[PDB]
PDB file of all heavy atoms in Angstrom:
ATOM      1  N   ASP B 406      90.339  58.694  63.793  1.00  0.00           N
ATOM      2  CA  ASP B 406      90.304  59.480  62.561  1.00  0.00           C
ATOM      3  C   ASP B 406      91.580  59.260  61.759  1.00  0.00           C
ATOM      4  O   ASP B 406      91.827  59.938  60.762  1.00  0.00           O
ATOM      5  CB  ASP B 406      90.157  60.972  62.871  1.00  0.00           C
ATOM      6  CG  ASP B 406      88.782  61.327  63.402  1.00  0.00           C
ATOM      7  OD1 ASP B 406      87.954  60.408  63.588  1.00  0.00           O
ATOM      8  OD2 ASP B 406      88.529  62.528  63.632  1.00  0.00           O
ATOM      9  N   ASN B 407      92.390  58.308  62.207  1.00  0.00           N
ATOM     10  CA  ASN B 407      93.642  57.986  61.542  1.00  0.00           C
ATOM     11  C   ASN B 407      93.794  56.474  61.417  1.00  0.00           C
ATOM     12  O   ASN B 407      94.786  55.980  60.881  1.00  0.00           O
ATOM     13  CB  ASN B 407      94.813  58.577  62.331  1.00  0.00           C
ATOM     14  CG  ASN B 407      94.865  60.093  62.244  1.00  0.00           C
ATOM     15  OD1 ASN B 407      95.195  60.652  61.199  1.00  0.00           O
ATOM     16  ND2 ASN B 407      94.531  60.763  63.340  1.00  0.00           N
ATOM     17  N   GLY B 408      92.796  55.746  61.911  1.00  0.00           N
ATOM     18  CA  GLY B 408      92.824  54.296  61.844  1.00  0.00           C
ATOM     19  C   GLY B 408      93.898  53.677  62.717  1.00  0.00           C
ATOM     20  O   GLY B 408      94.563  52.722  62.312  1.00  0.00           O
ATOM     21  N   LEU B 409      94.067  54.218  63.919  1.00  0.00           N
ATOM     22  CA  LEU B 409      95.070  53.710  64.850  1.00  0.00           C
ATOM     23  C   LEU B 409      94.456  52.884  65.972  1.00  0.00           C
ATOM     24  O   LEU B 409      95.142  52.514  66.925  1.00  0.00           O
ATOM     25  CB  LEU B 409      95.873  54.871  65.448  1.00  0.00           C
ATOM     26  CG  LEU B 409      97.003  55.457  64.597  1.00  0.00           C
ATOM     27  CD1 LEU B 409      96.483  55.840  63.228  1.00  0.00           C
ATOM     28  CD2 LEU B 409      97.594  56.664  65.303  1.00  0.00           C
ATOM     29  N   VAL B 410      93.166  52.590  65.858  1.00  0.00           N
ATOM     30  CA  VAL B 410      92.492  51.808  66.883  1.00  0.00           C
ATOM     31  C   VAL B 410      92.849  50.327  66.721  1.00  0.00           C
ATOM     32  O   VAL B 410      92.634  49.735  65.660  1.00  0.00           O
ATOM     33  CB  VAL B 410      90.941  52.018  66.820  1.00  0.00           C
ATOM     34  CG1 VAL B 410      90.627  53.345  66.142  1.00  0.00           C
ATOM     35  CG2 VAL B 410      90.256  50.874  66.098  1.00  0.00           C
ATOM     36  N   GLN B 411      93.426  49.736  67.764  1.00  0.00           N
ATOM     37  CA  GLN B 411      93.795  48.327  67.713  1.00  0.00           C
ATOM     38  C   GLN B 411      92.645  47.458  68.203  1.00  0.00           C
ATOM     39  O   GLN B 411      92.034  47.736  69.236  1.00  0.00           O
ATOM     40  CB  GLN B 411      95.046  48.050  68.558  1.00  0.00           C
ATOM     41  CG  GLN B 411      95.363  46.559  68.702  1.00  0.00           C
ATOM     42  CD  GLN B 411      96.649  46.284  69.466  1.00  0.00           C
ATOM     43  OE1 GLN B 411      97.718  46.121  68.875  1.00  0.00           O
ATOM     44  NE2 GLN B 411      96.551  46.241  70.789  1.00  0.00           N
ATOM     45  N   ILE B 412      92.355  46.404  67.448  1.00  0.00           N
ATOM     46  CA  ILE B 412      91.280  45.477  67.782  1.00  0.00           C
ATOM     47  C   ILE B 412      91.874  44.290  68.539  1.00  0.00           C
ATOM     48  O   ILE B 412      92.646  43.512  67.979  1.00  0.00           O
ATOM     49  CB  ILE B 412      90.580  44.988  66.493  1.00  0.00           C
ATOM     50  CG1 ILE B 412      90.038  46.194  65.719  1.00  0.00           C
ATOM     51  CG2 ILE B 412      89.460  44.022  66.835  1.00  0.00           C
ATOM     52  CD1 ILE B 412      89.443  45.854  64.368  1.00  0.00           C
ATOM     53  N   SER B 413      91.514  44.155  69.814  1.00  0.00           N
ATOM     54  CA  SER B 413      92.041  43.073  70.643  1.00  0.00           C
ATOM     55  C   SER B 413      90.988  42.171  71.284  1.00  0.00           C
ATOM     56  O   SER B 413      91.330  41.138  71.862  1.00  0.00           O
ATOM     57  CB  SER B 413      92.940  43.650  71.744  1.00  0.00           C
ATOM     58  OG  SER B 413      94.062  44.320  71.195  1.00  0.00           O
ATOM     59  N   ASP B 414      89.717  42.553  71.193  1.00  0.00           N
ATOM     60  CA  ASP B 414      88.645  41.749  71.778  1.00  0.00           C
ATOM     61  C   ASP B 414      88.415  40.475  70.961  1.00  0.00           C
ATOM     62  O   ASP B 414      88.140  40.533  69.760  1.00  0.00           O
ATOM     63  CB  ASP B 414      87.358  42.573  71.862  1.00  0.00           C
ATOM     64  CG  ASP B 414      86.825  42.961  70.503  1.00  0.00           C
ATOM     65  OD1 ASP B 414      86.111  42.139  69.890  1.00  0.00           O
ATOM     66  OD2 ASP B 414      87.129  44.081  70.044  1.00  0.00           O
ATOM     67  N   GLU B 415      88.534  39.326  71.622  1.00  0.00           N
ATOM     68  CA  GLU B 415      88.366  38.032  70.966  1.00  0.00           C
ATOM     69  C   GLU B 415      87.119  37.934  70.092  1.00  0.00           C
ATOM     70  O   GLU B 415      87.099  37.186  69.115  1.00  0.00           O
ATOM     71  CB  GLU B 415      88.339  36.909  72.005  1.00  0.00           C
ATOM     72  CG  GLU B 415      88.237  35.521  71.389  1.00  0.00           C
ATOM     73  CD  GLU B 415      88.236  34.415  72.423  1.00  0.00           C
ATOM     74  OE1 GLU B 415      89.218  34.310  73.187  1.00  0.00           O
ATOM     75  OE2 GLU B 415      87.251  33.647  72.467  1.00  0.00           O
ATOM     76  N   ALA B 416      86.084  38.688  70.447  1.00  0.00           N
ATOM     77  CA  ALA B 416      84.835  38.679  69.690  1.00  0.00           C
ATOM     78  C   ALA B 416      85.065  39.072  68.232  1.00  0.00           C
ATOM     79  O   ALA B 416      84.906  38.250  67.328  1.00  0.00           O
ATOM     80  CB  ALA B 416      83.828  39.620  70.333  1.00  0.00           C
ATOM     81  N   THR B 417      85.427  40.333  68.010  1.00  0.00           N
ATOM     82  CA  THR B 417      85.678  40.842  66.667  1.00  0.00           C
ATOM     83  C   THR B 417      86.811  40.085  65.983  1.00  0.00           C
ATOM     84  O   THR B 417      86.758  39.816  64.784  1.00  0.00           O
ATOM     85  CB  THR B 417      86.011  42.350  66.703  1.00  0.00           C
ATOM     86  OG1 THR B 417      84.842  43.086  67.089  1.00  0.00           O
ATOM     87  CG2 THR B 417      86.489  42.835  65.341  1.00  0.00           C
ATOM     88  N   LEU B 418      87.834  39.731  66.747  1.00  0.00           N
ATOM     89  CA  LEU B 418      88.961  38.994  66.188  1.00  0.00           C
ATOM     90  C   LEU B 418      88.517  37.642  65.633  1.00  0.00           C
ATOM     91  O   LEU B 418      89.052  37.177  64.625  1.00  0.00           O
ATOM     92  CB  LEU B 418      90.044  38.803  67.253  1.00  0.00           C
ATOM     93  CG  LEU B 418      90.653  40.119  67.763  1.00  0.00           C
ATOM     94  CD1 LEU B 418      91.682  39.828  68.838  1.00  0.00           C
ATOM     95  CD2 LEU B 418      91.289  40.880  66.597  1.00  0.00           C
ATOM     96  N   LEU B 419      87.532  37.023  66.281  1.00  0.00           N
ATOM     97  CA  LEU B 419      87.036  35.733  65.818  1.00  0.00           C
ATOM     98  C   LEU B 419      86.347  35.936  64.472  1.00  0.00           C
ATOM     99  O   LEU B 419      86.390  35.061  63.606  1.00  0.00           O
ATOM    100  CB  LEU B 419      86.051  35.133  66.828  1.00  0.00           C
ATOM    101  CG  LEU B 419      85.554  33.714  66.538  1.00  0.00           C
ATOM    102  CD1 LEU B 419      86.739  32.760  66.447  1.00  0.00           C
ATOM    103  CD2 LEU B 419      84.594  33.269  67.636  1.00  0.00           C
ATOM    104  N   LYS B 420      85.718  37.099  64.302  1.00  0.00           N
ATOM    105  CA  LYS B 420      85.034  37.426  63.056  1.00  0.00           C
ATOM    106  C   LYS B 420      86.039  37.485  61.906  1.00  0.00           C
ATOM    107  O   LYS B 420      85.774  36.987  60.809  1.00  0.00           O
ATOM    108  CB  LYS B 420      84.307  38.772  63.178  1.00  0.00           C
ATOM    109  CG  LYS B 420      83.079  38.760  64.082  1.00  0.00           C
ATOM    110  CD  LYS B 420      82.514  40.168  64.247  1.00  0.00           C
ATOM    111  CE  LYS B 420      81.279  40.189  65.139  1.00  0.00           C
ATOM    112  NZ  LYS B 420      80.121  39.493  64.508  1.00  0.00           N
ATOM    113  N   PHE B 421      87.190  38.104  62.159  1.00  0.00           N
ATOM    114  CA  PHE B 421      88.230  38.198  61.134  1.00  0.00           C
ATOM    115  C   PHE B 421      88.772  36.807  60.820  1.00  0.00           C
ATOM    116  O   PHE B 421      88.987  36.460  59.656  1.00  0.00           O
ATOM    117  CB  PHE B 421      89.381  39.106  61.593  1.00  0.00           C
ATOM    118  CG  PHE B 421      89.047  40.579  61.545  1.00  0.00           C
ATOM    119  CD1 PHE B 421      89.055  41.350  62.703  1.00  0.00           C
ATOM    120  CD2 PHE B 421      88.714  41.191  60.338  1.00  0.00           C
ATOM    121  CE1 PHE B 421      88.737  42.708  62.666  1.00  0.00           C
ATOM    122  CE2 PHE B 421      88.394  42.551  60.287  1.00  0.00           C
ATOM    123  CZ  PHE B 421      88.405  43.312  61.450  1.00  0.00           C
ATOM    124  N   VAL B 422      88.994  36.011  61.866  1.00  0.00           N
ATOM    125  CA  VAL B 422      89.516  34.656  61.711  1.00  0.00           C
ATOM    126  C   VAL B 422      88.574  33.806  60.866  1.00  0.00           C
ATOM    127  O   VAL B 422      89.007  33.159  59.914  1.00  0.00           O
ATOM    128  CB  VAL B 422      89.729  33.974  63.092  1.00  0.00           C
ATOM    129  CG1 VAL B 422      89.889  32.469  62.919  1.00  0.00           C
ATOM    130  CG2 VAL B 422      90.972  34.543  63.760  1.00  0.00           C
ATOM    131  N   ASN B 423      87.287  33.817  61.212  1.00  0.00           N
ATOM    132  CA  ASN B 423      86.303  33.030  60.474  1.00  0.00           C
ATOM    133  C   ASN B 423      86.207  33.462  59.017  1.00  0.00           C
ATOM    134  O   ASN B 423      86.044  32.622  58.129  1.00  0.00           O
ATOM    135  CB  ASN B 423      84.924  33.114  61.144  1.00  0.00           C
ATOM    136  CG  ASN B 423      84.905  32.454  62.509  1.00  0.00           C
ATOM    137  OD1 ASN B 423      85.683  31.531  62.770  1.00  0.00           O
ATOM    138  ND2 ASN B 423      84.015  32.912  63.386  1.00  0.00           N
ATOM    139  N   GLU B 424      86.299  34.767  58.771  1.00  0.00           N
ATOM    140  CA  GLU B 424      86.244  35.288  57.408  1.00  0.00           C
ATOM    141  C   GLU B 424      87.476  34.798  56.652  1.00  0.00           C
ATOM    142  O   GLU B 424      87.389  34.392  55.491  1.00  0.00           O
ATOM    143  CB  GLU B 424      86.215  36.824  57.418  1.00  0.00           C
ATOM    144  CG  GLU B 424      86.387  37.460  56.035  1.00  0.00           C
ATOM    145  CD  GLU B 424      86.316  38.982  56.062  1.00  0.00           C
ATOM    146  OE1 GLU B 424      87.049  39.606  56.861  1.00  0.00           O
ATOM    147  OE2 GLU B 424      85.533  39.554  55.273  1.00  0.00           O
ATOM    148  N   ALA B 425      88.624  34.833  57.319  1.00  0.00           N
ATOM    149  CA  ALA B 425      89.875  34.388  56.710  1.00  0.00           C
ATOM    150  C   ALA B 425      89.811  32.910  56.316  1.00  0.00           C
ATOM    151  O   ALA B 425      90.244  32.535  55.222  1.00  0.00           O
ATOM    152  CB  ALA B 425      91.036  34.627  57.668  1.00  0.00           C
ATOM    153  N   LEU B 426      89.274  32.070  57.199  1.00  0.00           N
ATOM    154  CA  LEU B 426      89.171  30.647  56.891  1.00  0.00           C
ATOM    155  C   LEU B 426      88.257  30.382  55.697  1.00  0.00           C
ATOM    156  O   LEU B 426      88.624  29.644  54.782  1.00  0.00           O
ATOM    157  CB  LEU B 426      88.671  29.846  58.103  1.00  0.00           C
ATOM    158  CG  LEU B 426      89.686  29.394  59.162  1.00  0.00           C
ATOM    159  CD1 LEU B 426      91.011  29.045  58.497  1.00  0.00           C
ATOM    160  CD2 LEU B 426      89.899  30.487  60.182  1.00  0.00           C
TER     161      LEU B 426
END
Side-chain angles (χ1 to χ4, degrees):
Chain B
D406 289 3
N407 290 289
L409 280 53
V410 337
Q411 172 176 266
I412 302 175
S413 298
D414 64 84
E415 183 179 300
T417 292
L418 297 178
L419 186 58
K420 289 174 180 293
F421 285 118
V422 164
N423 294 333
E424 171 178 52
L426 276 325

